[PDB]
RNA sequence: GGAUAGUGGCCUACCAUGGUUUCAACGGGUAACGGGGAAUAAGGGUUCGAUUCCGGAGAGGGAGCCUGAGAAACGGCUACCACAUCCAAGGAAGGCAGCAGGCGCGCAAAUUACCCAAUCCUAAUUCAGGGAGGUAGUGACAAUAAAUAACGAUACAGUUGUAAUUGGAAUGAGUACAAUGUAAAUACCUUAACGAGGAACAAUUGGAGGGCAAGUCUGGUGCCAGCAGCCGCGGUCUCCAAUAGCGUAUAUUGUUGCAGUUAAAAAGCUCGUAGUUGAACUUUGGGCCCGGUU
RNA sequence: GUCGACGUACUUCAUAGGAUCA
């Protein structure tokens, strides 16, 4: 005996035992209860819109440093302040205060990067293929 | 739905019609008639997709309105008239007569017949009952009501109906050793001899049928149609004589004839 | 203005057709094998 | 609406695209047979995998099993017809022993090279895509065309081709006209 | 922007474009809505009539 | 360098394949209920001609009654026998000496050390058993 | 998520807003004058010569 | 008994006290239309299925009906609830979850196109009608095949590599007589005549690694090291992967077969209902006959 | 109120061992 019923007519005890024990899994619990998106950085979304409050590392002396590429952004969905990466200081010129920035998951502690500014791809602006509409 | 349906999607149409699945979206819905919907071949499919006389539905309508097509000796003009099993289709201009018989594969086969054999048909007696004024009558599988039958005629027997008068010429009793034709199920189109009838009161009767190759199969009684005595069919049978052939033997025969 | 290719890195002509690039790579591989 | 039209993928990414040995083998195959990209090799690998899986499944069945006999005979017939499988090797065991290179061999590009019409496999591909090669009485412009045993003997320059007896191409008559002027 | 509406005019008859697409253009303008812009919402301006 | 090797690609090992069986391979086949012949035909989709050398056989006979099952499976007539011309009865050294000598064999083993030392040698497909069935490592034709 | 934007103030009056300025811009001879004539006829049923 | 097309607590009147349930009733949740099917997996299993077919329900939300064989119909009617159009203010007319096309934001995506020529459907009916349906147009949905060069000579550099070197042969992207195609067109397949050397008829998406200065910043066991370097006195580069496709972000329990002394988990002990499970025994053996396979 | 408990989500600390050589 393994501590589990084995009789040919004991199907029900096995099913009811399984259904009760399946809730132990954190993955299972999150999936059915729809709580798997609390841990998501954006609260379930793949991208986040934000307002550029300030360019923190604008005054850093060393060019192209990690600090120079960080911007403090307000998430419009909830108003929480977060920090985002820009691909390079050259791209930082495009970003200025009080524009919409679309953020995506990525100086430890910075977990976001800017992918679109003012509704235009930041990569496109860097490649000189578009103009930022103001 | 709020009433009878009037459309038939191509995918939902009977398989044995062999309709192209990409030619269109709809298929001919057989109108109400002697035969059931799923067990009938509308004249449009017969004239266009089998004989290839007409290229499209409009030409089929042109043919029918000319009154060249006769079903069972009567002119029909409905494109979707449900012709079916044991119905005689006469095209006088072509001097052609056809009897609709399932081939071994289970599909209606273009079988050409002589005029004399076209003069009659066979019908399975579905019902024997007294009508009004005490007049006995028989209802066959094609919905023909024939009054004053021979008293010995009982249900499941076969009656040879002359198309000109619509009267019974002769009849065959359903008995062991009789030649029968399968008209439903996976054994559709096969021919054999009765061996034994299992009876189950309040249930579906079963009939054991032995083929000429001595292979045996069991079929529900509703799908059996007596067509004559062994070796003496009352109608001309299509090619293959209702013998089911294995895939390997079919390959061998095909390679040989080619 | 028309193509709007912007700034892109300089790319060798062989990239334009993969077949030619693979041909050249295979020939170079045979030459290197002759040394091995 | 109209009934669906079936579609399918003719290739699948390998389990391990990043194996160095696999990269080297792909390089060798592409160079030897002048293949444009890795998609062709993946396609042929997918087909060969399908045939070999079917051969395994048929072998699993008992011998004389009617499905085994019929399907094995059909598969061996097809493989022999397409030329991959030789006449003397008509057994499912030898079907299971096939390799990708055999399928690449039957490609019309390789056959056109071998018969002597082209000086390179790449020249054969260019000739094919330029409508110079005809199988039988028919022009074929597809390098991946798989040549059957019967059709291998009928590969030739197309009648309409300048190399097949037609008039000179645009360049030739253009230069001739300029010289005449 | 991607998907921007672009209207097509074929020819000129009697110094007028075809009626049908002018209907399309007229309806499109009618239901149009305009964004709030920083400059135009912070200064007063007037086009001389 | 062996002429059967194109860079890291062995252009000699073609179906039907020749496969050397290591001692530990048999148990992990037994623990997983994987038939030796069908297991290989399944992983590689080819006919495989199993080969067992004397040294591995000598190891198996030494094991004792506990491993009688592996022994009789080892003596299956479908398993061909390889003669050994070297004194040492160690199996790992014998196998690698064979693959070094001629580049046609698949090595069937699960020993990490032997697997690593095979991995260093080029053009030697390495096969193992894990999970539910066999796995082939360095074989492009798959 | 795409519904979110930077908050802004629109100063357009609640009642009796001004007519919207439509600028017809294009290279010379492209048909600016005729387009204006075609539109004004539709909206007002009168043609401005 | 009434009603129903008809059986029936379907409803009425009188009667009895019954009906379901730990073998889970009743109640609650359901980002629940059901199925054929789709994905994955070695097998067991796990998930998806509004969506080409079948069946059910609905036409903004409830309620109720005429007609007719067939409707509780909504591109039929009537009220109420909510919206909302015209108005001379007395009144009138509404239902796109049909095809196009709009709004729902201040951030966005198929044409208010052509035809009944094929499919079949409706009618008094061969003919009329059919946004059902077909045809074409339009974001690389998902899929197939497949161009962007091939063969030579010369030159330069350490028998290999490099050409804004050089020769005459081939060809379709595109343009276009014509014809085919189609209801009429477009397109495809054909094809006169044009259409290639930077073949400028100018293939892309990612990653990796350099080197340079009278240049700039920072730190120090001198001349150095780190960061990095579109900026200097004047003056207006290499390689790797995929390939007509490529990148980024989020998401993505053990029946077979788990464990419970020492690092998840054995209840303080016993009794005990449901549930699961539960010792052995009843015609075995023997002697002949027939026809089948390998 | 930089309050308590719980739930949820994350961060963090505990990795070296044998042999040879100098
Ligand atoms: Mg025990
Ligand atoms: Mg009954
Ligand atoms: Mg030509
Ligand atoms: Mg003007
Ligand atoms: Mg719902
Ligand atoms: Mg569902
Ligand atoms: Mg569904
Ligand atoms: Mg309804
Ligand atoms: Mg609505
Ligand atoms: Mg209603
Ligand atoms: Mg309706
Ligand atoms: Mg409507
Ligand atoms: Mg609509
Ligand atoms: Mg549509
Ligand atoms: Mg009349
Ligand atoms: Mg085109
Ligand atoms: Mg009990
Ligand atoms: Mg017992
Ligand atoms: Zn040995």
Curated annotation (Swiss-Prot), chain C:
Residues 18-35 have a biased composition (Basic residues). It comes from the Eukaryota. It is found in: Nucleus, Nucleolus. Disulfide bonds: none annotated. Residues 5-35 are annotated as: Disordered. When overexpressed, has a role in the structure of silenced chromatin. Overproduction causes derepression of gene expression at both HML and HMR, as well as at the rDNA locus and at telomeres. Interacts with snoRNA U3. Interacts with MPP10. Component of the ribosomal small subunit (SSU) processome composed of at least 40 protein subunits and snoRNA U3. Belongs to the SAS10 family. Primarily required at the G2/M phase. Essential for viability: involved in nucleolar processing of pre-18S ribosomal RNA as part of the ribosomal small subunit (SSU) processome. This is Something about silencing protein 10. The chain holds residues 544 to 579 of 610 of the full protein.
Swiss-Prot record, chain D:
One of its GO terms (biological process) is maturation of SSU-rRNA from tricistronic rRNA transcript (SSU-rRNA, 5.8S rRNA, LSU-rRNA). There is a cross-link at residue 179 (Glycyl lysine isopeptide (Lys-Gly) (interchain with G-Cter in ubiquitin)). GO terms for molecular function: rRNA binding; structural constituent of ribosome. Pfam families: Ribosomal_S4, S4. Its main location: cytoplasm. Disulfide bonds: none annotated. Residues 106-180 form the S4 RNA-binding domain. It comes from the Eukaryota. PROSITE patterns: RIBOSOMAL_S4 (PS00632), S4 (PS50889). This is Small ribosomal subunit protein uS4A. The lineage of its organism: Eukaryota, Fungi, Dikarya, Ascomycota, Saccharomycotina. The gene is RPS9A.
Swiss-Prot record, chain F:
GO terms for molecular function: RNA endonuclease activity. One of its GO terms (biological process) is endonucleolytic cleavage to generate mature 5'-end of SSU-rRNA from (SSU-rRNA, 5.8S rRNA, LSU-rRNA). Keywords: Nucleus, Ribosome biogenesis, rRNA processing. Disulfide bonds: none annotated. It is found in: Nucleus, Nucleolus. Its main location: nucleus. Signal peptide: none annotated. Residues 17-116 form the PINc domain. One of its GO terms (cellular component) is small-subunit processome. Essential protein involved in pre-rRNA processing and 40S ribosomal subunit assembly. Required for the early cleavage steps of 35S rRNA at the A(0), A(1), and A(2) sites. Interacts with FAF1. Belongs to the UTP23/FCF1 family. FCF1 subfamily. This is rRNA-processing protein FCF1. It comes from Saccharomyces cerevisiae (strain ATCC 204508 / S288c). The chain holds residues 47 to 188 of 189 of the full protein.
Swiss-Prot record, chain G:
It is found in: Cytoplasm; Nucleus, Nucleolus. The chain holds residues 51 to 99 of 1183 of the full protein. Interacts directly with RCL1 and the U3 snoRNA to form a stable subcomplex. Component of the 90S small subunit processome also known as 90S pre-ribosome that consists of the 35S pre-rRNA, early-associating ribosomal proteins most of which are part of the small ribosomal subunit, the U3 snoRNA and associated proteins. It comes from Saccharomyces cerevisiae (strain ATCC 204508 / S288c). Residues 26-33 are annotated as: G1. This is Ribosome biogenesis protein BMS1. Disulfide bonds: none annotated. ATP binds at residues 26-33. Belongs to the TRAFAC class translation factor GTPase superfamily. Bms1-like GTPase family. BMS1 subfamily. GTPase required for synthesis of 40S ribosomal subunits and for processing the 35S pre-rRNA at sites A0, A1, and A2. Controls access of pre-ribosomal RNA intermediates to RCL1 during ribosome biogenesis by binding of RCL1 in a GTP-dependent manner and, via its affinity to U3 snoRNA, delivering it to pre-ribosomes. GTP-binding and/or GTP hydrolysis may induce conformational rearrangements within the BMS1-RCL1 complex allowing the interaction of RCL1 with its RNA substrate. Required for RCL1 import into the nucleus. Changing residue 32 to A: Strongly decreases binding to GTP.
